Amino acid sequence: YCKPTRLDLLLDMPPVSYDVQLLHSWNNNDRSLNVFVKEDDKLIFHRHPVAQSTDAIRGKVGYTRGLHVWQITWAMRQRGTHAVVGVATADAPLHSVGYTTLVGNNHESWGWDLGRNRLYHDGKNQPSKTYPAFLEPDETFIVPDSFLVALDMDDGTLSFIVDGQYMGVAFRGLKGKKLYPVVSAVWGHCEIRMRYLNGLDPE
Amino acid sequence: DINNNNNIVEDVERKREF
């Protein structure tokens, strides 16, 4: 549960400008059509209040190498029954009927369910895993409104940092892919912000 | 409903996938 040195270095760097944030923000050309990027606030998408629907959207950049960190802000009261945060390849589906853990439900996505404290990957075929891993079985862990996602494409891992605490590696095995930030949501009018902070090339 | 959604608004993504 100790931050890697490379991550400590990145987290120390001043964060990138809004102009650069916009290069990595939510892609309005790579979404469920039941969400949209807000015109006046392009770091944020809005989900239309569609019943029995789960909807996702990918960030503009798919990372293949280096360490990358971004910030998610997702207000507790706008999470509903299935608030999932992670990464996906370009082939991951961005919608399902019903309310589900869309991100992590297939071989193309890896998600942390913020309400369940559970990780999903190929979730129709594999069991979910408790995260953070230190939680005893019935134990509650409240994810705050904002937290960080760390994708290390060189090591091939996804981890999370919550209120400055490294929560451990969530997923492994990601080397050689091209992975995009993604969230799946079920709450009507939820607005979810993603802010890219920095990246560090390999070496 | 339980997720602040309703049946009145169109499921555009579902109709796009039809």
Residue numbers in the entry:
A (entry chain A): 31 to 233
B (entry chain C): 184 to 201
Which lines from the publication concern this structure?
The structure of hSPSB1 in complex with VASA was refined to 2.05 Å resolution and contained two copies of the protein complex in the asymmetric unit. Overall, hSPSB1 residues 30–233 and VASA residues 184–201 were well defined. The two hSPSB1 molecules superimpose with a main-chain r.m.s.d. of 0.38 Å, with deviations observed in only the N-terminus and the long loop connecting β10–β11 (both distant from the peptide binding site). The VASA peptide is bound to GUSTAVUS and hSPSB1 in the same extended manner, with the central loop B of the protein dissecting the peptide into N- and C-terminal interaction sites. Between these sites, the central VASA residues Ile191, Val192, and Glu193 make little or no contact with the protein. The C-terminal peptide residues were poorly defined in the density, with only Asp194 and Glu196 forming significant interactions with hSPSB1 Asn64 and Leu63, respectively. The VASA contact residues in hSPSB1 and GUSTAVUS are conserved across both sites, highlighting the importance of this interface, and both complexes formed with similar affinity (Kd  ∼ 40 nM). Comparable hSPSB1 structures in complex with VASA and hPar-4 reveal identical positions of the Asp and Glu carboxyl, but the shorter Asp side chain affords an additional intramolecular main-chain hydrogen bond. This further stabilizes the bound conformation of the peptide and provides a rationale for the more favorable Asp interaction. The most significant difference in the hSPSB2/VASA structure is the complete lack of electron density for the C-terminal residues of the peptide: only residues Asp184-Asn190 are defined, compared to Asp184-Phe201 in the equivalent hSPSB1 structure.
